[PDB]
Ligand binder design. Structure first.
Ligand SMILES: Nc1ncnc2c1ncn2[C@@H]1O[C@H](COP(=O)(O)OP(=O)(O)OP(O)(O)=S)[C@@H](O)[C@H]1O
Ligand SMILES: Nc1ncnc2c1ncn2[C@@H]1O[C@H](COP(=O)(O)OP(=O)(O)OP(O)(O)=S)[C@@H](O)[C@H]1O
Lengths: 574, 143, 143
């Protein structure tokens, strides 16, 4: 067997239709340290899939065919003849190894000094630890020549990396995530031929952009692949458009994944974090301090002093006035524009300081399921979520402490091991029980004595590391009387859009006197604070239904109409 | 080699005591007792040594001496202690066998020959000049 | 033979009805009684001490080469007592014993021999004589 599943290349390097992309040369030089390397003749290279681990090996050939490098190994076999020949040898069983053995003689004793390479070590050895690919490999490898595979790390690879045939054999030397600046030098070097065969012409600055931005925000698809897409994405519009710019190639992409790039293309970071801050003021008023308290490590977030792995967040004081938990996540969204952030864990099951039920729960060693599948998964999902807490934590101090780990420091104690990060994750434990002392309010604001003390009563309540680090504060005077009121127009403008504003432009009117009557009643002293939404909607939504029933009128309206006496009964006519 | 991993753990290049019997243990696998009576004996391929092989390797040229050049022109082969040692500690195997370096040994030969067929002064008596990827070497010839 | 033959006894060929019993269940564990009832006879193997193996010697001495085409080398060997013992030293491996042991006892003694053939002084004659690592005894008798 000769050329069939093989990658005949060095020629395609020697004739050179290959397009050089020159990455990190070191591990190659490291790899070059193979040529006569013996004891363990080779390392490996472990990336995630998309990184050109072999494009390296391709670039290696560029390091090779171009010669003027060590000719200690000079004559060449680089070519990977596996493919699927594993099962794809013939019409029946047993020839897989033949399929390589049919390779063996047409690969017989080496004139050409160059070891070749097959893909993964798990493309190597077929399934792994199977006869496929001549499971035992001194005799050729210590023998005519060698080969190389490569993959991503641990488990499947680790198993055969412990002993098997690699007991004597290769290490792994792993290029990084494609780094910062070169990536345009990459990209711009990618430019000329790739961009020359892509379309039109081009200029720098945009090239910088998604580079940053794929690097940004884009752990999945971190690789230029998207730019490489953006590349084709680029010509996509215009070359078409010309058949009959601004990084706005990136825009619709950044529209695609973000939902608008004006979300992604957007407040840059830091001033704009502060602009974010003032836009969160724009969001919700109430204690500016609360805002400002929340504003604190905003700047410290992502900027770092000791680590970004610092958790930066604004420890919550459990209560719900307006933005409260909600906007706290909304801002947390309004950080990343992503509302979704993190869920809540019911701490009910968490009652003790231990259970099989924990945010980790199981270790994944033995039968069961993952408890707290969130950060199990939520990071598998997503970086930089909100968090989840309770005014009485019924949670296990275990994890709380195991998160006091992640609490004080940044990296969290991954139960299964893999603090994939704490980078942008900045969130604040939400607890307070002092409601009856929280009940201490007069006027629009509270002077602090109580707020020291139940604080104190809590300050020592659950032990200090909790209450030790992580400054910022959350304060509740609630709404005094009106100020919340503006929420209505929100509440209003929560309406029309949700489906289509088109449905009803009718936009009505709120007759503050009602909104008073609405609010004054409608939401408790304590809270009672949701329903008027859930409510006033209705009797109105009746008219909605109603005026949608027999249907004489269509307009954009202003309602502003109202009369136990507890009901003056708003309504609205045609 | 079913037993050889007993000396994988470096054990008894000279076996004594019960190792052979522990060695004889894995025997029973492939074996059967009818097979027993009809079996003469049991004999190793040993672990050798440079103490052995450092001389053995020598033979390997006296081995290969007249291969290519039949009667044409012989050589001299000054080596001394480096060009005694070098290529042995270069290419021997403590795991594969006598196998590996042989083919290697073939290599450096013809390379110098490649040199010397590139050259052809180097008429009959030939000595060897060797000094210190891996395996830093020199291994040259005057001419 | 599967059973408390495992213990055998530690006593002697009598062992005991115990083991003899121990087997019966150990028989009747898995097996089929009327089929077991198909057994005509209860037979067993015992502990043979010296005298047996002592004789097994006496047996083997002649015993092997006997049939051989030309024993015309007229092989008497010897004992006194001594010669019996040297293997009877090792004479019985509790596990394996003679048939394995003799197999080499066969060999080694036999191994000793084409020597005297090669020792090219005695040709057609025999006696054995020996004296005693602890090895030497081992045949080799001059003309
Ligand atoms: N300068 C460079 N040096 C080395 N490789 C590069 C360079 N620029 C781009 N590449 C890689 O070249 C690859 C060509 O496509 P493929 O290698 O098939 O995809 P790949 O997944 O990157 O390769 P793997 O999986 O890492 S071996 C791209 O995926 C890039 O990751
Ligand atoms: N402007 C606002 N005024 C009052 N409540 C608001 C406002 N914006 C959001 N919310 C509330 O944000 C809540 C989510 O955060 P939480 O702090 O858990 O509230 P809560 O603890 O359920 O008690 P509430 O919200 O005061 S009834 C929702 O229940 C909404 O009532």
């Amino acid at each position: 067997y000769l050329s069939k599943y093989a990658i005949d290349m060095t020629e395609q390097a020697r004739q050179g239709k290959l397009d050089p992309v020159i990455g990190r040369e070191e591990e190659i030089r490291s790899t070059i340290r193979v040529l006569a390397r013996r004891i363990k003749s080779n390392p490996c290279l472990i990336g995630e899939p998309g990184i050109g681990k072999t494009a390296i090996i391709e670039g290696v050939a560029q390091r090779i065919i171009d010669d003027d490098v060590p000719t200690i190994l000079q004559g060449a076999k680089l070519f990977s003849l596996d493919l699927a020949a594993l099962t794809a040898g013939a019409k029946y069983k047993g020839d897989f190894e033949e399929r390589f053995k049919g390779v063996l003689k047409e690969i017989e004793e080496s004139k050409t000094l160059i070891v070749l390479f097959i893909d993964e070590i798990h493309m190597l050895m077929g399934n792994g630890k199977d006869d496929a690919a001549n499971i035992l490999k001194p005799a050729l490898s210590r023998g005519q020549l060698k080969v190389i595979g490569a993959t991503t790390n641990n488990e499947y690879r680790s198993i055969v990396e412990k002993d098997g045939a690699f007991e004597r054999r290769f290490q792994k030397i792993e290029v990084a995530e494609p780094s910062v600046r070169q990536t345009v030098a990459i990209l711009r070097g990618l430019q000329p031929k790739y961009e020359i065969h892509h379309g039109v012409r081009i200029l720098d600055s945009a090239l910088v952009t998604a580079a940053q931005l794929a690097k940004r925000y884009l752990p999945y698809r971190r690789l230029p692949d998207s730019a490489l897409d953006l590349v084709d994405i680029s010509c996509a519009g215009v070359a078409v458009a010309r058949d009959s710019v601004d990084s706005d190639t990136i825009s619709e992409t950044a529209a695609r994944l973000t939902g608008i790039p004006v979300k992604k293309l957007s407040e840059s970071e830091n001033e704009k974090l502060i602009h974010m801050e003032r836009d969160l003021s724009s969001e919700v008023v109430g204690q500016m301090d609360a805002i400002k308290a929340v504003s604190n490590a905003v700047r410290l977030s992502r900027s770092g002093l000791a680590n970004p792995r610092q958790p930066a967040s604004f420890l919550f004081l459990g209560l719900s006035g307006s933005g409260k938990t909600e906007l706290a996540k909304k801002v947390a969204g309004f950080l990343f524009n992503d509302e979704d952030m993190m869920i809540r864990v019911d701490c009910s099951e968490l009652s003790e300081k231990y259970a099989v039920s924990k945010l980790l729960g199981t270790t994944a060693g033995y039968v069961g399921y993952d408890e707290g599948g969130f950060l199990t998964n939520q990071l598998q999902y997503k970086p930089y979520s909100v968090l989840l807490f309770d005014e009485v934590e019924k949670a296990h101090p275990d994890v709380l402490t195991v998160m006091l780990q992640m609490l004080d420091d940044g990296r969290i104690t991954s139960g299964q091991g893999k603090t994939i990060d704490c980078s942008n994750c900045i969130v604040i434990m939400t607890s307070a029980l002092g409601a009856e002392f929280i009940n201490s309010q007069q006027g629009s604001k509270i002077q602090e004595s109580t707020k020291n003390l139940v604080m104190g009563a809590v300050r020592q309540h659950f032990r200090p590391e909790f209450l030790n680090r992580i400054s910022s504060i959350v304060i509740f005077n609630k709404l005094s009387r009106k100020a919340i009121h503006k929420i209505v127009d929100i509440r209003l403008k929560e309406i029309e859009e949700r489906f289509e504003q088109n449905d009803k432009h009718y936009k009505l009117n709120l007759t503050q006197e009602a909104k008073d009557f609405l609010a004054k009643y409608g939401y408790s002293d304590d809270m009672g604070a949701r329903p008027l939404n859930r409510l006033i909607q209705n009797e109105i939504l009746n008219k909605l239904a109603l005026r949608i029933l027999k249907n004489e009128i269509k307009d954009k309206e202003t309602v502003n109409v109202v009369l136990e006496a507890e009901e003056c009964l708003e309504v609205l006519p045609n």
